[PDB]
């Protein structure tokens, strides 16, 4: 996985010859070119050169080029982070998530979550999988691969988890639960629609729409309680929620459209009675480690295509760089 | 005639304070989260918007958290959840955010309008970017998100004048005079304007 | 004068004594005072309940057709003048208030019944 | 309010629908004075006696 881009189409091998140039232009407060920050990235050769870059990218975050931090400038730092440690300063970059702005949503994301189980590294695989829900993602086959990691900690962690980590679990099953393959991705979405709907009468719908992209709509349990009909046309967590709600700031609602603390008897038989069919028509950790094997033909065909698409990038931009310094 | 040499010099030196050393967008649109005042300006806000500043979220405090700042995304006004239950929204083509801001925000963008499910092309400027009534439409629920499907009489004295003029003009013409409202369209009040129709203060 | 932000607001303007006020319509200008200059001469208004109780307003409408058709602006009390007349339709400030006091009269016919 | 808001609207519609009539009538009078059916007789006749 490492030795494919590392035919890097060579450049010079100094860093402080550049480090006295970008800050100098920042003390002119003029913008900095897009190939000149990657050239500060593909010359990293120690541990100390990692942390000068996270200054400099944080400085490059405050530049008249808010964009032009290209995604391959990220990847040629992903390979540097995956080379040296990829343990704390790779994740500390994702921690701020606005001050560095990496957003690695491609098969580069698949370069960085297969190798966390290769060091088994418990405490922080929660955090990166938390930090792809906040990206709009899962058009790549990481859909199985995302919920593959959260079922590892569903067995590891069983608490109230936080104020907001109830939502941190269901949204990492529901967008993974867009599966036309099985009943399993139609089983993972129900865990999402349950746990997102349990703060509905506990804290409020503003919990649902703080930061991770859910909807302002009220209905998520009824979405599960309509697709559980399709499961009966073509689950040990929602019974616990079915009793606890009937167990013991601005207005959003209309007084005509009824409060859903008054539908709790109407939530019981609407959920219970169709599970009789679901024994009569038709564990969770191990059935997705099958999807690790039966699926994943390892689509690097959009990875190496991007690598040759990045020879298209650097050459036609160093060509116009050649234009700007001859007209002087 | 006697020329005004100094007042022309301060016409332009003021005007090269008007572009050059301006306070950028996060220095004056910064707010107080306790008293709900503002640094560098000082004034406070009307009663319908004190909590909305404190509780809810901007147009580009949010969009500074996405790959390419959400280059093709969808967004609605918060009262366009509350005034049109029909989908009424904005899309995105280009971002001009700000770099001076720690917690980068307060920027500018534009893109496609579509009012109440009525689509328009040749994208115009998005409004109210500084406000906190702007809602981040997720990637799920898009194809069902887009869920969308003469004349009045004249006032009384103008009835009597035109008709009695017609028997002066010769023909009686009791034919009911009816002015056309079909020429004039029916624009509502939360329909957004051009943002460069406003200048920055 | 070069007035910046200039637009004809069509106004009655006071020109009468104290305690018998008397407003005069001229095609007024926005930022000037009540008794400032204007665009053109119009025909005045009587707020005085006189002999046999009449309170007169004049209208040459061969020009009040023309002068809003010259792109003029208007404010609230004169929408009461032409909506009441039959040349313009009526404004939503009598539609509330003729019925608002009818909601006060309905509050008063119970008031005259909760005493008797 | 809400029935008055459409009455604000149905104020705003018809007199605007009258307003285009108010504009064009004097624009039929800047046109009758300039290019009216007797005004064309003016343009020929003022040269007709004069020659």
């Amino acid at each position: 996985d490492s030795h494919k881009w590392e035919a890097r189409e060579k450049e010079h091998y100094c860093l402080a010859d550049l480090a006295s140039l970008m800050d100098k232009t920042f003390e002119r407060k003029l913008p900095v070119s897009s190939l000149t920050i990657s050239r500060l990235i593909d010359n990293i050769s120690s541990r100390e050169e990692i942390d000068h870059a996270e200054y400099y990218l944080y400085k490059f975050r405050h530049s008249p080029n808010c964009w032009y931090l290209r995604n391959w400038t990220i990847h040629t730092w992903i390979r540097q982070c995956l080379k040296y440690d990829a343990q704390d300063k790779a994740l500390y970059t994702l921690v701020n998530k606005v001050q560095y702005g990496i957003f690695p949503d491609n098969f580069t994301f698949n370069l960085l979550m297969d190798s966390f189980i290769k060091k088994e590294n418990y405490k922080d695989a929660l955090s990166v999988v938390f930090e792809v829900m906040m990206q709009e993602a899962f058009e790549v086959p990481s859909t199985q691969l995302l919920s593959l990691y959260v079922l590892f900690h569903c067995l590891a962690k069983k608490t109230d988890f936080s104020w907001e980590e109830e939502r941190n679990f269901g949204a990492s099953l529901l967008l993974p639960g867009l599966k036309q393959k099985n009943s399993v991705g139609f089983s993972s979405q129900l865990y999402g629609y349950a746990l997102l709907g349990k703060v509905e009468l506990q804290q409020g719908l503003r919990a649902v729409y703080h930061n991770m992209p859910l909807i302002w709509k009220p209905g998520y349990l009824d979405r599960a309680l309509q697709v559980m009909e399709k499961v009966a046309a073509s689950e040990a967590l929602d019974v616990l929620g079915a009793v606890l709600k009937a167990l013991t700031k601005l207005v959003e609602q209309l007084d005509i459209e009824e409060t859903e603390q008054s539908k709790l008897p109407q939530y019981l038989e609407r959920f219970k009675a169709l599970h009789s069919k679901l024994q009569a028509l038709g564990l969770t950790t191990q059935l997705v480690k099958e999807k690790l094997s039966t699926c994943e033909a390892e689509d690097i065909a959009t990875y190496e295509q991007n690598l040759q698409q990045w020879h298209l990038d650097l050459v036609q931009l160093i060509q116009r760089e050649q234009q700007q310094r001859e007209q002087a | 005639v006697r020329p005004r040499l100094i007042a022309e010099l301060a016409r332009r030196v003021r005007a090269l304070r008007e572009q050059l050393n301006r306070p950028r967008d996060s220095q004056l649109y910064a707010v107080d989260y306790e008293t709900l005042t503002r640094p560098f300006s000082g004034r406070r806000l009307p009663v319908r918007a004190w909590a909305d500043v404190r509780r809810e979220s901007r147009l580009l405090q949010l969009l500074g958290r996405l790959p390419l700042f959400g280059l093709g995304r969808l967004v609605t006004r918060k009262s366009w959840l509350w005034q049109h239950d029909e989908p009424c929204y904005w899309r995105l083509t280009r971002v001009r955010p700000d770099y001076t801001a720690q917690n980068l925000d307060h920027g500018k963008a534009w893109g496609i309008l579509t009012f109440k499910g009525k689509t328009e092309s040749e994208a115009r400027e998005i409004e109210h970017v500084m406000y906190h009534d702007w809602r981040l439409v997720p990637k799920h629920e898009e194809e069902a998100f887009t869920a969308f499907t003469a004349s009045v009489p004249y006032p009384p004295l103008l009835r009597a004048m035109i008709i009695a003029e017609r028997q002066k003009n010769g023909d009686t013409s009791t034919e009911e005079p009816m002015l056309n409202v079909q020429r004039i369209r029916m624009e509502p009040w939360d329909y957004p304007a051009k943002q460069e129709d406003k200048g920055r203060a | 004068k070069a007035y910046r932000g200039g637009h004809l607001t069509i106004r009655l303007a006071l020109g009468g004594c104290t305690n018998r006020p008397f407003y005069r319509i001229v095609a007024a200008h926005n930022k000037c005072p009540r008794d400032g200059r204007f665009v053109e001469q119009l025909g005045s208004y009587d707020p005085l309940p006189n002999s046999h109780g009449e309170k007169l307003v004049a209208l040459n409408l061969d020009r009040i057709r023309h002068w809003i058709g010259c792109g003029a602006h208007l404010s609230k009390p004169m929408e009461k003048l032409l909506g009441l007349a039959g040349f313009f339709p009526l404004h939503p400030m009598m539609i509330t208030n003729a019925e608002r006091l009818r909601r006060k009269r309905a509050r008063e016919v119970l008031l005259a019944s909760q005493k008797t | 309010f809400f029935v008055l808001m459409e009455r604000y609207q149905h104020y705003r519609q018809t007199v605007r629908a009258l307003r285009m009539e108010f504009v064009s009538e004097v624009q039929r009078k800047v046109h009758e004075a300039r290019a009216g059916v007797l005004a064309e007789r003016k343009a020929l006749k003022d040269a007709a006696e004069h020659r």
């Binding site: 601005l250 959003e252 459209e257 | - | 006091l101 009818r102 009269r105 | -």
Partner: peptide, 29 residues
């Protein structure tokens, strides 16, 4: 007006709302 539309205006103005009758009486003497 219809009440579901009127429910929107109730939904906006929690802290400051009055309660009113609908139609007026047809006459007053």
């Amino acid at each position: 007006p219809p009440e579901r539309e009127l429910s929107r205006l109730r939904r906006l103005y929690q802290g400051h709302l009055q309660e009113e009758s609908g139609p007026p009486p047809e006459s007053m003497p």
